[PDB]
């Protein structure tokens, strides 16, 4: 009985920003989702099409876990169908989703006394994100008719703003580490059972 690695995607020392989230393919496991559901440390455990008590009695083919760090007030936008600055431009979930969104407070780790400017998010885009698509393109969007050659004074605005993370912000503006488990069932032998 070899259990599945959840101990490097949950309690990791440093996650990634929301505009470049970490996608980790999990396969050939025996997972234990009941240890996750009865941990009493997460603040948001919402499953969106499966039952959380019947997670162990399911055989999938791949499980994909997406880790990122957002504000506490923006964990609502990791729902199927919701909109906002995060669901439109950073991380879009489709409205046929089958997975469980997990989140917990992380003010002790992702906040420094001067401000942690390591967590970025995308401010605008050309069009909305079709679901499960990342876009890491640091281009200055060229508003106006003159090629500005890599400046930020007038138009030619930068597309990525940094999160302002202090330890005195508010329980909705503290950094909430979010991991999104997504279950996929292809036409293949099922190996992730539990």
């Amino acid at each position, epitope marked *: 009985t070899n259990l599945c690695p959840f101990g490097e995607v949950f309690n990791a020392t440093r996650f990634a920003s929301v505009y470049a989230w970490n996608r980790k393919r999990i396969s050939n496991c025996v997972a234990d989702y009941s240890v996750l559901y009865n941990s*009493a440390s997460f*603040s948001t455990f919402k499953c969106y099409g499966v039952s959380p008590t019947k997670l162990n009695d399911l055989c999938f083919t791949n499980v994909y876990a997406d880790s990122f760090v957002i504000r*506490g007030d923006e964990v*609502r936008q990791i729902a199927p169908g919701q909109t906002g600055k995060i669901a439109d431009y950073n991380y879009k979930l489709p409205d046929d989703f089958t997975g469980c969104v997990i989140a917990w407070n992380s003010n002790n780790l992702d906040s420094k006394v001067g401000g942690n400017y390591n967590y970025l998010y995308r401010l605008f885009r050309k069009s909305n994100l079709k679901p499960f698509e990342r876009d890491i393109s640091t281009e200055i969007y060229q508003a106006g008719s003159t090629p500005c050659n890599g400046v930020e004074g007038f138009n030619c605005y930068f597309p990525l703003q940094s999160y302002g993370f202090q330890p005195t912000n*508010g329980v*909705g503006y503290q950094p909430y580490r979010v991991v999104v488990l997504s279950f996929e069932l292809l036409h293949a032998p099922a190996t992730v059972c539990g």
Partner: antibody, heavy 121, light 104 residues
Framework: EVMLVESGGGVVKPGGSLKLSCAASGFSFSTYAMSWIRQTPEKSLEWVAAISSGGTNTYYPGSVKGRFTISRDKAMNTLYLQLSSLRSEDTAMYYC??????????????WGQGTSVTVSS | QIVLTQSPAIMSASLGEEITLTCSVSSSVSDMHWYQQKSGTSPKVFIYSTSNLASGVPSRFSGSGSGTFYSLTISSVEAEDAAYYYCHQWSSWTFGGGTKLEIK
């Protein structure tokens, strides 16, 4: 009917220790996140402590962190916020506050009556 | 740091006229709740999630707003609705300023 009654409030000189109580009765206790809210005498409310449903995550603001401590007892069905190192701006009236969900993100449904803590002399 | 500003500090309406209470936020928040404190009682709750009403509130109070501007609208102000109104959101650590309402 839900009833939230407070106690413990009184007069203490600066540097003292004081423990407020809040006996909750009328609902299933340990499935609702609770919080304390003070009202300075200019009638300006502010959070001062907030605890989730399981009693695990407690959040304090930057001005009172390290000297105020919230507690939660499922057994005798009370709620404690004990104070320490009182400054001269901690004169207020402390309300007992119950949220609507198992976290501190929901709305504050029912408020207590509050008993004042005045620091002077 | 979220600041929650209400404009102005004190309003005043006549018996039966409509009034709109404003609560502008510094940066973007999701929703906003509204509380009412009378003279000498604890505050209660009227509006949660900017559009819902609590149990037992008279049905002249309505809310609107998203982003950084939130509104509380009373249809026909009568004599009982004379109290302070604080807007608080989960991400602030302080409440709103509080706009008094007094019958003209």
């Amino acid at each position: 009917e839900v009833m939230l009654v407070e106690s413990g409030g009184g007069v203490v000189k600066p540097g003292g220790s004081l423990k407020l109580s809040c006996a909750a009765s009328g609902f299933s206790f340990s499935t609702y996140a609770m919080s304390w809210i003070r009202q300075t005498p200019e009638k300006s409310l502010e959070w001062v402590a907030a605890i989730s449903s399981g009693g695990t995550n407690t959040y304090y603001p930057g001005s009172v962190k390290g000297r105020f401590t919230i507690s939660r007892d499922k057994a005798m069905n009370t709620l404690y916020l004990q104070l320490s190192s009182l400054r001269s701006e901690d004169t207020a009236m402390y309300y007992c506050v119950r949220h609507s969900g198992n976290y501190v993100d929901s709305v504050m449904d029912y408020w207590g009556q509050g008993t004042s803590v005045t620091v002077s002399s | 740091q979220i600041v929650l500003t209400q404009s102005p500090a004190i309003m005043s309406a006549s018996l039966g006229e409509e009034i709109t209470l404003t609560c502008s936020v510094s940066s973007s928040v999701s929703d906003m709740h509204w509380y009412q404190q009378k003279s000498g009682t604890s505050p209660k709750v009227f509006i949660y999630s900017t559009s819902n009403l609590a149990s037992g509130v008279p049905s002249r109070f309505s809310g609107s707003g998203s982003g950084t501007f939130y509104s509380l609208t009373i249809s026909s102000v009568e004599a009982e609705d004379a109290a302070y109104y604080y807007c608080h959101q989960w991400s602030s650590w302080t409440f709103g300023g509080g706009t008094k309402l007094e019958i003209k």
